[PDB]
Amino acid sequence: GNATPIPGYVIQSSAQVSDDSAVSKPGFPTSGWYPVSSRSTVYAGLLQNGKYADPFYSTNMQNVPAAQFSVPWWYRTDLNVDDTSSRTYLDFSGVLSKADVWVNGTKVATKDQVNGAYTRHDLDITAQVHTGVNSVAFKVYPNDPNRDLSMGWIDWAQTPPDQNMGIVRDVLVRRSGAVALRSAHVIQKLNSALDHADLTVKADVRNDSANAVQTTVAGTVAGKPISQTVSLAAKERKTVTFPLVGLDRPNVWWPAGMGGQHRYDLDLTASVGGTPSDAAKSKFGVRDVKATLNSSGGRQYSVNGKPLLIRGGGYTPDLFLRWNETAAADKLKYVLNLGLNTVRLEGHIEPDEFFDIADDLGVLTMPGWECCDKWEGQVNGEEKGEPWVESDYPIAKASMFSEAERLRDHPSVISFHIGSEFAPDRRIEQGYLDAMKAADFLLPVIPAASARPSPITGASGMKMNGPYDYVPPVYWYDKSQKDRGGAWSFNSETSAGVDIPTMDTLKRMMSASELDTMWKNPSAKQYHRSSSDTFGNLKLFGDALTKRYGASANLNDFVRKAQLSQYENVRAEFESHSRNYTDSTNPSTGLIYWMLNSPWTSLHWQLFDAYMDQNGAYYGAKKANEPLHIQYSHDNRSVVVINQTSNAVSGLTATTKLYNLDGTEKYSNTKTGLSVGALGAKATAVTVPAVSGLSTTYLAKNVLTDSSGKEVSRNVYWLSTKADTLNWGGSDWYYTPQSAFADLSGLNNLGQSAVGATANSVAGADGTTTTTVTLKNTSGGRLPAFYVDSKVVDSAGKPVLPVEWNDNAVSLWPGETTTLTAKYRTADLKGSKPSVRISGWNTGTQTVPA
């Protein structure tokens, strides 16, 4: 019952190996071969060793010769085998694109069999294993995402020079007696009251011995003993189905904030002749999920019978598939810090630990296949992926089975997208459905992330109408254009494009001259945006920033304006979809922001950056998704309250005030006694009237306070008397041009205010530090302290990351105080005492000891 991951390999080009058989022979010389950890692509392995400069900086990645990766690279290792009494197996997936497998000078599998990133292989190498030093070598073939059923990067970033070839998941060495236990899982069904579940345990046993055996498969499901005995002929594999197990008052798994994230255990041993032969331990959550089409045709998810507005982002791994468990946990915790409930994985489906973490944290996941490459190459037309041949069909189906088998028992998984872009055809779709049936994968299947139907499953209930680049905030409030990306139906992937990271991240990823060009000529191409010509520059964004904003006076000016723009836009995108969720006709049922994060250092499609720093887009998403939230509608000037929490709330007061940039209050309304239902319900406080005397750019301060008088939401909008308007007839697939632009340039001349800061830190026994910062507006006038950003830094002024704040990017009127709380690992201080850098739009920059 041993399953031990190969900890590492030495790698080299097949340019250097003239006899393939020789690599896997014990004692093969590997002088000048590169030592690499588990889960490395070739180029990540070369990075580990020296060998090229940081691809996260400037055009470093362009200087890597890519031709060396158009030939196979070997992954070789020793294994010590102390005892050959047990059988020996290689159990793996994650080979990009395909591989020959060798043990002790014998080829045990070819690239025709071991083929496809997602396919699982379970190779009995018992005939080849001997006592003492054994050796295993994979000849890994080049990866082409347009030709191979694999992973590729589409238009998200720049192409990795090796195209991610290598082994990106673990290779398990498995040991067992005559019988191998495989594919153990629990079918779980919960009643609608959620107080009783029925559990069906299934497990495969395989007799790999020469002789017929009796095996007993026994252990525990959810604390309850179970046992079955079966007969197996030599080389026979059987699926064992256990009698039904009742579970009363199950500890139901819930999404974060809706309850706990309990997972039960399955523990099974297959025994032969009164001796253990193989063993497996797994987990499962008791949880119902549905995703059905509403009366408007929108895809509507529900978990444990509770309908849910999906609020998420498109999640991506590292560009070079470099795996780190803590980094994965850190990215999923940021999801919760943002107040998001879901991540989408378009392809690049993460290793198991990612889903374990997501299960433990209560983050929902939407895995599926990606667009624009081999997966959709048969239904794609003039895409980039190649039409399918007969040998493609088995590989795709086997990939589905393997993914359905890994994913089925993770309660965070809420669906599988079998298409993206284009829905599968009948033949390909039938293969997917058959594979999921064979895996007992019982979650919702979605045919596409666009509006395209599949033949068997049918309507998607989703839309992919863009945008992917600059649109003003009011755009998101559109329900008139059925071919655009307003707040209605299920928005599977959309953003307003460019997301300039913080200055600290910028100085790490781009040269002074690269950065100079970014503010001076946004029309120029940026390597750290995208390889596609459509998204190769920042023109649409830079044009809107100047127009709306005001022209940039320097780099600092451009970055500060970018943060306001991103905050404003991302906030509006989310707030519109929260508001329209409870519409009687065409509600918004989902929004996945494009994207949560980037594979590398980027200028677009991210909430948090590659270093986990947090910018205007991060804080705007966090503002929008707060659990008890007040917001202003860009279309109709209604002030709206959203309750994301699992309980109805009452006695709320919503207070809305307008101010000119000189600090003059121009409007006040106090709406007391508000009630709002649970799980995304809303209430309207007031509709702000057109107010006479407003400065061209003015402020709207929205404050929500509960029945105890506590402030639970503060939301401040910088608004213009000049409307943003759309030229709908100029719309393309990725944006809608503007016919007129708001004038927010008055912010340029907002008088200086003052803050007002005190910080302290507590190093905890759990290895975390909490830094508390009290901020006050200490000015003697009427001016707010606007857009005040606090960052935990070290003694050298470098940000401590990852970090989680309760709130940030706050605005304080004179005399007003707020207390903010940041949490992070003590060790990420790297021995420095903590400080807090506080910068505001009109309050300057200071740092205070913490």
Curated annotation (Swiss-Prot):
pH dependence: Optimum pH is 5.5 with chitotriitol as substrate, and 5.3 with (GlcN)2 as substrate. Activity is lost below pH 3.5 and above pH 8.0.
Activity as a function of temperature: Optimum temperature is 60 degrees Celsius. Stable below 50 degrees Celsius, inactive above 60 degrees Celsius.
Region (Disordered): 835-850
Any one Gene Ontology cellular component term annotated for this protein: extracellular region
Family: Belongs to the glycosyl hydrolase 2 family.
UniProt protein name: Exo-beta-D-glucosaminidase
UniProt entry keywords in alphabetical sequence: Carbohydrate metabolism, Chitin degradation, Glycosidase, Hydrolase, Polysaccharide degradation, Secreted, Signal
Coverage span on the entire protein: 49 to 898 of 1032
Role: Hydrolyzes chitosan and chitooligosaccharides with retention of anomeric configuration. Has maximum activity on chitotetraose, chitopentaose and their corresponding alcohols, with a slight decrease in the rate of hydrolysis on longer chains. Has no activity against beta-D-glucopyranoside, beta-D-xylopyranoside, beta-D-mannoside, beta-D-glucuronide, beta-D-galactoside, beta-D-N-acetylgalactosamide, beta-D-N-acetylglucosaminide and alpha-D-N-acetylglucosaminide.
Compartmental location: Secreted
Catalyses which reaction(s): Hydrolysis of chitosan or chitosan oligosaccharides to remove successive D-glucosamine residues from the non-reducing termini
Catalytic site: E421, E493
GO MF, one annotated term: carbohydrate binding
Enzyme class: hydrolase
Coiled coil: none
Top-rank lineage group of the source organism: Bacteria
Assembly information from the UniProt record: Monomer.
